[PDB]
Amino acid sequence: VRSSAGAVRDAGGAFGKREQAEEERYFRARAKEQLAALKKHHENEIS
Amino acid sequence: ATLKDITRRLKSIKNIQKITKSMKMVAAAKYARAERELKPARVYGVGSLALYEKADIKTPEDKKKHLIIGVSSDRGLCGAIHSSVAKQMKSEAANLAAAGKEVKIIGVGDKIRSILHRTHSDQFLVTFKEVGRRPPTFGDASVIALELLNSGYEFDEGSIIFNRFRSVISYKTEEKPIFSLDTISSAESMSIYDDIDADVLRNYQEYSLANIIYYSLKESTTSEQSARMTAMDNASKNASEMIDKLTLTFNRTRQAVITKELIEIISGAAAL
Amino acid sequence: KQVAGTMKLELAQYREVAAFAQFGSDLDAATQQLLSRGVRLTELLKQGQYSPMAIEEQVAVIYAGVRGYLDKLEPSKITKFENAFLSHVISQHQALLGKIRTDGKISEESDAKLKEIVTNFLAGF
Amino acid sequence: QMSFTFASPTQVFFNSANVRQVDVPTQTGAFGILAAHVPTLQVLRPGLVVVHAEDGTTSKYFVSSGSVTVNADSSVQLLAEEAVTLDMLDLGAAKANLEKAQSELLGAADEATRAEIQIRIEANEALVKALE
Amino acid sequence: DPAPATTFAHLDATTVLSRAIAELGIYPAVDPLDSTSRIMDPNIVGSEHYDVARGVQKILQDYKSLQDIIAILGMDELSEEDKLTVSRARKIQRFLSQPFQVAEVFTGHLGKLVPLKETIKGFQQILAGEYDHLPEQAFYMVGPIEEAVAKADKLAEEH
Amino acid sequence: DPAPATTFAHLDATTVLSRAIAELGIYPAVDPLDSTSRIMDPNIVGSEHYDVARGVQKILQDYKSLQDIIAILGMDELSEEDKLTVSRARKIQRFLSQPFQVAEVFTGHLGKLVPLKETIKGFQQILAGEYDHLPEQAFYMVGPIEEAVAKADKLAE
Amino acid sequence: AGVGKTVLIMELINNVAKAHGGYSVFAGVGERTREGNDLYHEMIESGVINLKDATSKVALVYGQMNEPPGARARVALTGLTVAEYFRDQEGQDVLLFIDNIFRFTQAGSEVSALLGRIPSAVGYQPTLATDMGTMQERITTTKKGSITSVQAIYVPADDLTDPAPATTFAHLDATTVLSRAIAELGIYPAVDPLDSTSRIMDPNIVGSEHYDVARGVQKILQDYKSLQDIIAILGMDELSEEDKLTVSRARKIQRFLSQPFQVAEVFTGHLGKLVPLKETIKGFQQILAGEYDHLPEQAFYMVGPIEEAVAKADKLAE
Ligand SMILES: Nc1ncnc2c1ncn2[C@@H]1O[C@H](COP(=O)(O)OP(=O)(O)O)[C@@H](O)[C@H]1O
Known about the structure:
The structure is cut from a larger assembly and holds 1 copy of chain A, 1 copy of chain B, 1 copy of chain C, 1 copy of chain D and 3 copies of chain E.
Chain B: H1 3-54, E1 68-71, H2 81-97, E2 105-108, H3 110-115, E3 124-128, H4 138-150, E4 158-167, E5 170-178, H5 181-186, H6 200-270
Chain C: H1 4-15, H2 29-44, H3 55-67, H4 75-92, H5 94-103, H6 108-123
Helix pairs in contact in C: 1-2, 2-3, 2-4, 3-5, 4-6
Chain E: H1 2-7, E1 13-14, H2 19-23, E2 36-37, H3 47-73, H4 83-96, H5 104-107, H6 116-128, H7 145-158
Antiparallel strand pairs in E: 1-2
Bound molecules: adenosine-5'-diphosphate.
């Protein structure tokens, strides 16, 4: 047996769930910031 | 479990073991660098502390303001570094609040802020991020000192908690006191220092604050990198010790699968 | 043999510090140079459908790559360099390729001429 | 005797050394420290500290800022924020920076900027006066 | 298994639907790093189509490799050339999803057809970085790329 | 295996003794998350009994889920609620162990019968948090929780 | 492959034919025809086989890989027959190389399947234990002579509990682990000093001085292996004097384990040496006690007795 790439997600163990949750956290934060910036740009562009 | 489950778990654990091993290498490199940089900073900070060491300034214990500064980095995976520093910070804050002091807290590093944002959440005065990503410098200490002095908090005393780097295996959560020019002026032990008005004395106090912040930054950075090296070494050893058992189980299950399939084939062949 | 003998060792060294490639920084110049040579060597071995290369051209490309005339190049461009350098050598210096093909060896005269060709081309890229 | 300790954050020049006399600048006024100088605290100004060993040797280190402490037990601690030996500087850069600062001080954008430019001015001025 | 393993040799194109992708809600669940074809060549489909397809596959594979690190370090520790890789890969994963006209019973959305040019152009743009400013959820279950832009605008407005 | 797999359907209450627990020294080695009964009903055993049993199982299951991370990243990489859960789970795992009368010759310890009310009370207390100050080993091989407190007192001197 | 298996086999053949007068047999069970021809020509070149003057030291028996299983399961017995003659009817010691011993069990398995016998645990024949026993139990030291068998071993799936190696290892009286990681370092033979083991590493069998020297070398090499990590992490400058001394001793011992082989002269060019047992024990006793802390590492690379290492040390400073 060898090791593949991205096997932690495949295993589905605690580490896979933990990784998926961490990634979702980070990108939820960045999505909130990007949505705020998009609203701000849309207000700054009516002028 | 089935052969597929053991195969898949074993692959994942091999991945984790490799990641932790490379992490231990990187942490060892950053440790060598930080422990090389800490030599001059150790003597620099010790010299800075020398004054208050050898002219004792017992603060007047009838003050209301305090300041507790904890030092650590943004990153985890470093043992109980942040845990110990936050434990000391909360211990001191509670002991001081027993007497009704208006304590306040500056957290250097996001981890310290987070560990103390449940209780002592309100007492935060200001906090800093991007600590430990790169080695600290006197510029960082100057920035912390500036953002402390400008913040309109006339603290009458303070403590700084950090992780003194005893050795690659051990660190000690040390605390160093810090005072204010109102304490220095009224400290009779300063009577034997000449050319001391309230201008050079408190410029010197500002510089002393910056010095202690920088010394604590260097000590804590070295301690954090040593702790991460040890933690990732232990994690790699745990992963390997787990892969031993998982490989044994995988081989047992592989042989069981071969035997079972073969017995099914020959039992079908015999039955007809 | 002359060229792949050292290419094999360079890739062997790269394969045992491959994991760091992500971290990349935070490491000394030793492993940094190891995995900066390995990436170039790897990107030389990429090849396309139904386009085999004559032995002398493989030797020329691996010579350029391993003797060190590529470590100052962004990896993503390496392929282009190859697909350019190859053609260039095919056009102008056919005599050198003929000598390598027939002698079956990189004589120090041919070695020097090839170094000159690689240096001159790499200069104007 | 005197126990000297001259140490930039980056590097340490003397650690509990034993020098005869050390001449240091200061906000109040540049002055010299000998083996029994009365205790004092001071904060340095852009200048050049001059050290002399037990013998008659000398050494000049240009210091930007810091603090010099002289203690009861005859222990000098000269912590300098940026201490560089003179052989690390170049004239033209400092001179041009000084002249630029003098030029911009006319532009009283604000008192804080006036003070910042003044600090840069006399910094480079000490640099040139050390190198001129 | 012997049955699918033996069938693989009798097809000119396979689209291996995956349960793991279908768990992330991406529908169709087609596995980008296991679906293959025989006409995926620079001669039969054109240079730009081929370059974009290989770019999508390579970025997804890089993301797969990165997830192993993200498992331990957390994702704030990733370098700044890789956080970009992860974000782009997530955007591409979402953009590969699409609502079908026969799934209106499940999703409620309206089925769409995306001619080839829109797909190639949208993936070119997502790879180039022309959409680093939109949230990833802006691409979930949309047709052409312009619809992802409109959806991002609507999310922002309703924010 | 076909034999136990088949017999699982003929029993009211099963009690799965496991070698993994026995290698930890806990005895009886009963596995708390494989043992089952058909009278684990709030209308049969009351509500306090059922709630205590289900809280014990919930916390043990949470600790089992954590074990995968704990075995590599250590306990220094857990939230504070997770550290507290692990501490309670270890206390409960130990407290489930009991010394039997017939095992005096093995252990030397004195065999105990723990009445049902004492068991419910002790586990209710451990779950509430009335014993977060004691160490794990204070619960190892004791009868009712009074003996656990007494042993924790002995260890403190 | 690539580690020195054939050169080591040739050296063992030569030394045992030279220091004992005992011949050797090579039973190539399941032998690739290409590899068999290459081995034949390597031997002819190296002198162990000689086509002219009836002084060959090897009897080659080849059961090729393209013969029905019934013939690959019996060639080991042909080799054993020749060697048994050399032991009983000529009363001497013999070497018996068996490359490979896995292909022997596999051939037996195929024969048993052909006959129609229920396959055992993992598809191996039901008679695996006694099929191995009948062969392995004729390689012994009777009262006329001895057959010493060197059996190349392949471990299927890197599984040391597979029925084939599991049955084989019940008979092995020693193990020699050639490793690539030591051919890279230039030490030859590549024998791995730590993986290699033996049953007679017992003070009763080999003696107290031999035993203690062997354990001293093993301990120091283990310590150097452990310290290599710390040297690779925390730097060399942070090691005590004793640690640095052990590193020096370990590097010198490493280099001293290397030896020049009379059959690999054309590679090294160095004239081959045959180090008698007592000389080896003396050399390692001296190196461990510290008598040679004042010599350079390269003075030990590819030398025979220790005194020859001293001679090299002198000649490399003149
Ligand atoms: N003692 C030695 N001296 C010099 N070279 C050696 C020695 N042992 C092994 N080698 C080299 O290692 C290579 C391994 O090849 P060989 O052992 O002959 O076949 P195989 O790799 O099948 O065992 C040889 O070509 C030889 O040059």
